[PDB]
Amino acid sequence: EVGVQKCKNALKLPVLEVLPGGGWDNLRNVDMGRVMELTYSNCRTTEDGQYIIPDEIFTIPQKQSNLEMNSEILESWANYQSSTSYSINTELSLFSKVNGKFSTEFQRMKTLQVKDQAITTRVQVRNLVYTVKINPTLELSSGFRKELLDISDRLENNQTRMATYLAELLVLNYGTHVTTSVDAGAALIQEDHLRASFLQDSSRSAVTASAGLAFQNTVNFKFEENYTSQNVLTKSYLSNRTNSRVQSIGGVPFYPGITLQAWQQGITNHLVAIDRSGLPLHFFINPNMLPDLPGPLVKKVSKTVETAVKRYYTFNTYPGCTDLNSPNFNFQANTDDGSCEGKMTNFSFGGVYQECTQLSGNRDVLLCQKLEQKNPLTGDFSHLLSQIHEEGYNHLECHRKTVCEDVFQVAKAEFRAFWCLLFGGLFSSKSINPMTNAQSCPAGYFPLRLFENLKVCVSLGSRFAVPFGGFFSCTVGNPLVSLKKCPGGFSQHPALISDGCQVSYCVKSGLFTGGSLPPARLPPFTRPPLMSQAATNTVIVTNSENARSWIKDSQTHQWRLGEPIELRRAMNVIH
Amino acid sequence: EVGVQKCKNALKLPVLEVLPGGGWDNLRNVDMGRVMELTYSNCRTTEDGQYIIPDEIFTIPQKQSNLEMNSEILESWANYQSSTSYSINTELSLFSKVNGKFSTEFQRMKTLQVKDQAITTRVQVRNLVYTVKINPTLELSSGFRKELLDISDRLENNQTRMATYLAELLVLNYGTHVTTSVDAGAALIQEDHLRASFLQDSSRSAVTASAGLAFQNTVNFKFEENYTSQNVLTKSYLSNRTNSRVQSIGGVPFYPGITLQAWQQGITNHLVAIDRSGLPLHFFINPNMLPDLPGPLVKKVSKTVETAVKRYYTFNTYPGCTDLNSPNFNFQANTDDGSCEGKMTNFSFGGVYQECTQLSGNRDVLLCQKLEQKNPLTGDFSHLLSQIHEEGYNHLECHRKTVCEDVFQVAKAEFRAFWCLLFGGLFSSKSINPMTNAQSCPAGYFPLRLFENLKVCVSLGSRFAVPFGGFFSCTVGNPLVSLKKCPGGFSQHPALISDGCQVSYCVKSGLFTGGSLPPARLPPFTRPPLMSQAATNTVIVTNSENARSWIKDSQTHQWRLGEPIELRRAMNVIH
Amino acid sequence: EVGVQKCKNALKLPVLEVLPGGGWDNLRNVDMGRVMELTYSNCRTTEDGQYIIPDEIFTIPQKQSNLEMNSEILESWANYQSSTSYSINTELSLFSKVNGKFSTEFQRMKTLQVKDQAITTRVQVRNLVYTVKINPTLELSSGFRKELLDISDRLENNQTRMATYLAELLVLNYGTHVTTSVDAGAALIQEDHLRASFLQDSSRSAVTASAGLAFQNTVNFKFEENYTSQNVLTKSYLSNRTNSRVQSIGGVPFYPGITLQAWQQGITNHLVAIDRSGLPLHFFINPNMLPDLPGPLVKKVSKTVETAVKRYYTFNTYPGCTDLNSPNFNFQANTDDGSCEGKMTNFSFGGVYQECTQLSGNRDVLLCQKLEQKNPLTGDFSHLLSQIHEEGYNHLECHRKTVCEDVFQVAKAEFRAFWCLLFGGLFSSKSINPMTNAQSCPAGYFPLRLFENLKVCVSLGSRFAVPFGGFFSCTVGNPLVSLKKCPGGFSQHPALISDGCQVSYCVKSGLFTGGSLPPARLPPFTRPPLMSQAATNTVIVTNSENARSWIKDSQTHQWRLGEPIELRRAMNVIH
Numbered sequence A, B, C: 001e002v003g004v005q006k007c008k009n010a011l012k013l014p015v016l017e018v019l020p021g022g023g024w025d026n027l028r029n030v031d032m033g034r035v036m037e038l039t040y041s042n043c044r045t046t047e048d049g050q051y052i053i054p055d056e057i058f059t060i061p062q063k064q065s066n067l068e069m070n071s072e073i074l075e076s077w078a079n080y081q082s083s084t085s086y087s088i089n090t091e092l093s094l095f096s097k098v099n100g101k102f103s104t105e106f107q108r109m110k111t112l113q114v115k116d117q118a119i120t121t122r123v124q125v126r127n128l129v130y131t132v133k134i135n136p137t138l139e140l141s142s143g144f145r146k147e148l149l150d151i152s153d154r155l156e157n158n159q160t161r162m163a164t165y166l167a168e169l170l171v172l173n174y175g176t177h178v179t180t181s182v183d184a185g186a187a188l189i190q191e192d193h194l195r196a197s198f199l200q201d202s203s204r205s206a207v208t209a210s211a212g213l214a215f216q217n218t219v220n221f222k223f224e225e226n227y228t229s230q231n232v233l234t235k236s237y238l239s240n241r242t243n244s245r246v247q248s249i250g251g252v253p254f255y256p257g258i259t260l261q262a263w264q265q266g267i268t269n270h271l272v273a274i275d276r277s278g279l280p281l282h283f284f285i286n287p288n289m290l291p292d293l294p295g296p297l298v299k300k301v302s303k304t305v306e307t308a309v310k311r312y313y314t315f316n317t318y319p320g321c322t323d324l325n326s327p328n329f330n331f332q333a334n335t336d337d338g339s340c341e342g343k344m345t346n347f348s349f350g351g352v353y354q355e356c357t358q359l360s361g362n363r364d365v366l367l368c369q370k371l372e373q374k375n376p377l378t379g380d381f382s383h384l385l386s387q388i389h390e391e392g393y394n395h396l397e398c399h400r401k402t403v404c405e406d407v408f409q410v411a412k413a414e415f416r417a418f419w420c421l422l423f424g425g426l427f428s429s430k431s432i433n434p435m436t437n438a439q440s441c442p443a444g445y446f447p448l449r450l451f452e453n454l455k456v457c458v459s460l461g462s463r464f465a466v467p468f469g470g471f472f473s474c475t476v477g478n479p480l481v482s483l484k485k486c487p488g489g490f491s492q493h494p495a496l497i498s499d500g501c502q503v504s505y506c507v508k509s510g511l512f513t514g515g516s517l518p519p520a521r522l523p524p525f526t527r528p529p530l531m532s533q534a535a536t537n538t539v540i541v542t543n544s545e546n547a548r549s550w551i552k553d554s555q556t557h558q559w560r561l562g563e564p565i566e567l568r569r570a571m572n573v574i575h
């Protein structure tokens, strides 16, 4: 009797199930949580009277049905076209070559093209019924507004490591984009994979017309073979096809033999999104959407969320060779590198060493064990990055009467990795060693620990040997090519992202390259901080350019614009 | 019981779903938000008693059904005819060659004509049921009126950078035009693509009559082949066709085998817009639509919105070669240039350099790093534009008792780009480098940063080398052709629109040209300003020519016409 | 009238049976108990109005139907793809090669590939109807919250052995993961096993197209043979197939002859989970989910549960040879080792001996019997690990009047195992001796007890002799290869996990290898402790870095933030 069911009891007609305002992960092409609030307290319908819609949603009747007679030809996976989220992937961004490269649809097409040198053809029927958009005047959802205020509280109390962590949880829960418009409808798609040698034989206009005719035979005729696309060209066509599937998106489920008439009757009340557009997530963090906060404080929240989205694109970028016919083809690479024609020069190094340094003298945990490692061939330790490894421990003291008390300290320790035998190559915790596919070293190799969770397999051992190309990081390059990329003929691979620092290495294995595609490193990219910083309660927020000031009322009820008498009355206890 | 549902419960008949008064993007041909207010508080219907309409909408019964026997022939994509928004694209404007050039329908026709040298034919059935118009006496919507008052407030407080930003958000949300009349109906269209060599063979009257006959075979007969357009001419016709599709726009969804009788029965209650006319968005910003504002103040708001629409057309204009048979054909060019017959002269330059200058001496951010770059071949830095790069930072001081306070400053910095090796060529953030299609430099090339987010790949490296043609901007041309265009044989490409300043460059690659079509740079074209200006509260608005004056009542309730006693009583505290 | 049935009586429509928020065992791929709370006190439905859902669950309408024409080919069991829990097995973890390796589906595929050198093909129809996710703002279930507070109470009272035991009961009841999203739908799968020699014969595209055609003959046609996939290729295909099954997952039960039309009608109200994603179990133990506990205390609970999950993966990891064509293939090994090419060197040892040491002088139990064993060939006892064997006993004293009293002591005893004849080899309690498959020694062999429940069969006896490779443990390696792995040509086998210490041994039998697959060692891996430690009641919890403190109110009602007056008032009785 309140909200959705009040409309449904009064009107007796369904609710439109394709709605914008939700979050969107633009790498995986999945829907990620509700950013905007959608309330039903006006009983609004679409103007044809078919669907209940939210009060702040307007629809545009398209009623458009497209029917193709020819299949398209998609030449390569690098220029990927989604067919269900095409508008939001190809937006103007500095990340356009990574969008949609971790979706289930893309992983299947990249596998099938590389595995048996195939090109993909697509023919489809497409029904666009409504375009569904948000109004510009629109409020945030309560769950999304609450998680933005928590990032604001951690930035006031100078808890930057905690605020960066909560921003990466926001990207995990709400994605990178917010959909502002969705195309509601249904589609029926056939996707074939043909040998690339069959293409280059005048050719293309006769192939694609037969693929579109075979598609209409598959839908209209039953599984008993009564087709009409059987001629001389099809006997070669059926033998060069390496894979074939039919998918329905919306409507009734497809089976071979449903007519195109009957599939188009079941589209009603089964609409899904077949296209969508949107804006980045930090666009909707501005003083208009968050009115009960100071001005420059929400631009600091929006800058934190924007940095978290940009890390999510950078940690999932794989530069490398992309040209399939060339040697040193990198199958895990989603971005080209220019290293297709690469001359390889072998060069070795002695070993890799570490040292450990404790800022706090600890008699409890003894962090120096299993953190420092010396060279096997030099004997002692003889820079990549510079970071601090903290750990919390517990004291527990009593006094007999028995009551007790426990204090929690933070044991700090600091390590330094360095480079300047037999390989290998390496494996971290979260990765495996593709020399063994086993998170272990081969026979005759002992692991060298170079980080907190990374092992390097180093020693008859020449049967497993792979070359080497250097290390680099997000701040330090390598001189082997102060530049980030590998030398030519080498492929780069991530190894133990630590505190938001991507450190990589270069090899010439060929077995680190092949295998399954990497499944999309998700935030958070840092362990939760140990809360090593005290809450510094800010009371006055101001900026010098506007001479505007914000003072919140005790005890932390609401922010409020200031008055120059109330400023210096509060600046006396502040300064 | 209030508004729409009060009419529907009383009358028991649907609402007309094709309504004017909404916003319209004339580049992409999409509907963009509601500009006019449409209320239903009279229960008005169309005069045939079929549809509920708004109170300020009048309809004209057309009841017109057009049935073509011959296909048209559309000769080229430059003279594009939309078939669903033809009247509003071809209006009298200074932008007529860019209208509709980013719509989904145009992108498909330009691709299919260029890819296999095709000409497009179109045959259609078209039902115009109503012409639906707005009355001249009409009010603005509440959401659109609210966003115009926010532009008025930023212009009163001398916040010009914020008012320009809010005007570009108005174009993003509400488009460039407002539809004043829409043609409600349904259409059934077949679009073929034939080889251009098949056209020039007496010919045209026999081709188009067979295409119109094949269209009526496709609709009337089932997918089982029982057609009557099978003769000697069709066997050549079926072999020169490169693509074919059938689309329905409104009505029931099309399938091959629905009769033309049956398709025309399902048009009722499924009407869509098949044509529309309209006026520019700034036409509706005038003292009659906004009565509760001063006179010259709304002409300042209308001039701001008009400038924002004109930037949206200018940033999406691509001059270049258009003649398909000529060399140096620019596939990304939507506007002709006159550089079809172009003689190429090679000429090099040494390098490109920058200097940085801080207006504020900052001991916190140190903007000089990663902003200045020197020449690799000269050693030191030895003009395109002149703009200021600002950045906000945060101080945080405490006093132990612990309360705190944080001030936000604006760190200003100013850079200068300059021109007067091996290429290349370049890539910005939001663009990629089409030498690699990868947002990266080729092998042997290191990036030269020339802007805040732009890289220029400059060094065996002659295998990737492309020529060079110069730089120019919206204020500074180049002498290589003080003129804006490229020299002959070169194509221009945008690179890092910065603060509303289009700066471009010229190349002779051939790989920067090809690829997918650019997807329509959308507003805002500037980052949000850092609010570096104080609110100057204007109280009296007047003009010298009329001697009329407007004084708003404290505290900022409403504007009001003035009296000469109340002027000098308020001019005493003003001057 | 309260909860679930209140919704069902009002709405008269079923409840969605595929819900996230439950626990998940990622080794066995089974559902393990309810972690999150799901309440129905809003009568929420899916937006198509088909299913009642919980109030903190949102669904995404997918309505997606995939229909494959070609079977896949899965090359080996090491790269296992689950087809029903594929997303949660292949997550980014340091355990990725053990996930799903104890599920019923994997045990069948690994058996059928090894037994008759087979490769597996899979073809499937797959209907994804909804994606069902949890909101980020979500509370824990009452049963799961109660078992986390019990781990908190044992850590306050310094009862670490009891808290480690209750953490392993949490993994047994609630699994290792929590599902955050489930794909609701139905699938119809055919899985064949073909001879691997039939694969390598152009070949793969004709095999998989016939397997997909035979699948559609099996579903559509009745058991009376009327198939259409009968040609020259199938007569070889039917003879190289070693096993074949059809499974339905969701929907109506499959029988040969149900049409694909009829199977897709019965999917409604019979949805199951066909994919799922999730996060580790210790991710949901944080101060936001448990608000009524101190800060650093729940990070100690989360570290205890994380250690228990990591033991569950480590005790079920079997390194060894994996290459099927090589000798010394280890059938029980689920993780590769690099010991495929291994040269075997025979070397013997004299014997194994033990000594016992009692820390408490006991005149009641006499633990020295059946705990110490000497060498048969040396005569006396002449280190693996160092652990204490405790035992509780009972006194019972009376005084005639007759009332009584019984005290429970803890008899401590400590044993030491050592190494430095004829085999063998050994058997523990929970294992058997695969030389006899009988938990007994062969003829001519007497058992040598090396642990509390382990026997070693050591002596005409050369007919049962197997070689030897050494012992090692989780802290002590062996020098025969201070390294953990076996020497080459040897396989490792677990033997009597004792107090969380995996101690293993190496053999070259070939009969310890073969047999059935090991059925997934489940927690707890330790007997319950004898409660040998007094409750040390902590009252004040604090940490030095934040200077925050928590004081619970007498008598142990609730925790509460502290005040500096109440600290030293409570630190007086504490110190």
Ligand SMILES: *[C@@H]1O[C@H](CO)[C@@H](O[C@@H]2O[C@H](CO)[C@@H](O)[C@H](O)[C@H]2NC(C)=O)[C@H](O)[C@H]1NC(C)=O
Binding pocket: A195, A197, A198, A199, A200, A201, A235, A236, A239, A240, C202
């Ligand atoms: C893959 O396609 C090629 C064509 O590019 C096929 O080769 C032709 O097959 C037809 C079939 O009878 C022959 O008549 C031609 O002589 C073949 N050669 C050429 C150059 O056209 C090839 O057969 C296809 N692959 C398979 C496995 O059939």
Ligand SMILES: *[C@@H]1O[C@H](CO)[C@@H](O[C@@H]2O[C@H](CO)[C@@H](O)[C@H](O)[C@H]2NC(C)=O)[C@H](O)[C@H]1NC(C)=O
Binding pocket: A202, B195, B197, B198, B199, B200, B201, B235, B236, B239, B240
């Ligand atoms: C494309 O169109 C041309 C005509 O412009 C076709 O060429 C003719 O095809 C017919 C078909 O039998 C022949 O009888 C003529 O002799 C051809 N030449 C001329 C000059 O008319 C051409 O065949 C078409 N393309 C394809 C692939 O069929």
Ligand SMILES: *[C@@H]1O[C@H](CO)[C@@H](O[C@@H]2O[C@H](CO)[C@@H](O)[C@H](O)[C@H]2NC(C)=O)[C@H](O)[C@H]1NC(C)=O
Binding pocket: C195, C197, C198, C199, C200, C201, C235, C236, C239, C240
């Ligand atoms: C297993 O597969 C092999 C093919 O790899 C079969 O061998 C062929 O069988 C056909 C059947 O008539 C013969 O015509 C061929 O001459 C055989 N050899 C080759 C090299 O193709 C084998 O028969 C299959 N196993 C069984 C038991 O039938």
Ligand SMILES: *[C@@H]1O[C@H](CO)[C@@H](O)[C@H](O)[C@H]1NC(C)=O
Binding pocket: A158, A536, B396, B397, B398
């Ligand atoms: C804020 O945190 C930073 C973190 O390093 C620290 O350096 C700084 O001193 C802190 N400032 C205050 C006022 O607490």
Ligand SMILES: *[C@@H]1O[C@H](CO)[C@@H](O)[C@H](O)[C@H]1NC(C)=O
Binding pocket: A396, A397, A398, C158, C536
């Ligand atoms: C806590 O338990 C450990 C277990 O060995 C013991 O060593 C320690 O003395 C105990 N501390 C207190 C305060 O009871």
Ligand SMILES: *[C@@H]1O[C@H](CO)[C@@H](O)[C@H](O)[C@H]1NC(C)=O
Binding pocket: C396, C397, C398
């Ligand atoms: C308990 O029973 C045992 C049984 O043999 C006996 O030896 C012992 O004396 C009894 N103790 C008491 C206190 O009754």
